[PDB]
Design a protein around this ligand. Sequence first.
Ligand SMILES: Cc1ncnc(C(=O)N2CCC3(CCc4c3c(=O)n3nc(N5CCOCC5)nc3n4CC(=O)Nc3ccc(C(F)(F)F)cc3Cl)CC2)c1O
Ligand SMILES: [Zn+2]
Length: 417
Amino acid sequence: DKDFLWPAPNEEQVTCLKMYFGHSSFKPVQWKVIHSVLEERRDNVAVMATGYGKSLCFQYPPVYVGKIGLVISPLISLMEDQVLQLKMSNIPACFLGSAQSENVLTDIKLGKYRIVYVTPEYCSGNMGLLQQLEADIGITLIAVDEAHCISEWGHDFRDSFRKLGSLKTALPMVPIVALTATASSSIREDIVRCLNLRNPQITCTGFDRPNLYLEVRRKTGNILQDLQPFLVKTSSHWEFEGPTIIYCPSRKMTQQVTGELRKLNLSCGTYHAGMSFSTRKDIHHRFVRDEIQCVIATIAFGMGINKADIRQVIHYGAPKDMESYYQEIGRAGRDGLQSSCHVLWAPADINLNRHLLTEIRNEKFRLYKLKMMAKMEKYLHSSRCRRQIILSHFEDKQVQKASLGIMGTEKCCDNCR
Ligand SMILES: Cc1ncnc(C(=O)N2CCC3(CCc4c3c(=O)n3nc(N5CCOCC5)nc3n4CC(=O)Nc3ccc(C(F)(F)F)cc3Cl)CC2)c1O
Ligand SMILES: [Zn+2]
């Protein structure tokens, strides 16, 4: 479990997790948030469907470094429940408010508490307190739960969240972890703007995505022969069933593939590292406008596409690894309508070529890259449920419990069919 994280949690981080939280391992997304907070001091928008595996992301870092973490939330009963859990785990924690202040505030200032829960109403009155705690202790992170409540445009607006924009003014070097259940690109942008987040890490987890069909199929090598099954012949030209992305492992392939689809007069365009920002922009704009149907691309394309109606993702060549693959298929069917994700792989794919990783001189990184390639190859070669493999590696056990409906049916994956 620890072998698939970059960089690997050290031995004292694992010991800390076991002692204080009772867990043996970090899930990749949990590690993604914790490491970015601890080492990069990086702002996060962590979209989480449920509270399962959620709290660790903001509770673990201040416990590990033995400093202080702030959790800003309006969910009073849930905050009280979490304060009791932390206390019962021998983590010193409290609810800080006007009524509680006499009991706790001197102790908070003296650095006796790892985790302090506050309402957004209390926080806007006490930016001076946070400055003192930053100076005297050092604030590992500020968590803003129900972060969607800052957006006037969302369904559950709270005026109390408006003044949380000042956190980055008052405390420009403390990273903010914004947490919400809503996967709206619109609300994410509102959260980023209203909390003044700087280049935030965006993750989205806890969702089972029942509308994504998964298939792995052997690649002949003949590009037209390989992609012919996906095409529909109109009087004018051949075309895909809907908005499509074809992810290719190199820039040489993106040209080759686009060349073969060009011969069919298919409305498509190439994207890669080595193209004009102006051309990349109109591709992005045409795709969003539905002026080109398909996009042939490298790992470069997809981040902040926000396009809800991607019906088909094809990996023409084995993906880089399971992390990139997860990001790439995650962009399919955000509208919640039926989408398909196909891998077309051969044994001669660059991303299954060990020789290139054998030549990497940094040993810890070499052994990570080989372990990730092998995990990818074990997914592609599997006869077991494609969905079960992906949820098991990336998602909390709760996501698998919810997903038992789709799993096993003719719409789950090629192996369940
Ligand atoms: C601005 C920005 N900055 C950085 N990066 C990206 C980016 O390009 N990405 C970041 C987000 C990704 C990554 C993960 C993921 C993404 C995503 O947009 N949505 N939208 C949903 N839906 C929307 C509709 O309501 C329900 C949830 N859920 C997600 N998820 C989770 C997911 O898809 N989990 C999953 C589950 C099962 C399987 C199966 F195969 F086992 F079935 C696969 C997966 Cl991946 C997309 C990439 C960005 O935009
Ligand atoms: Zn399946």
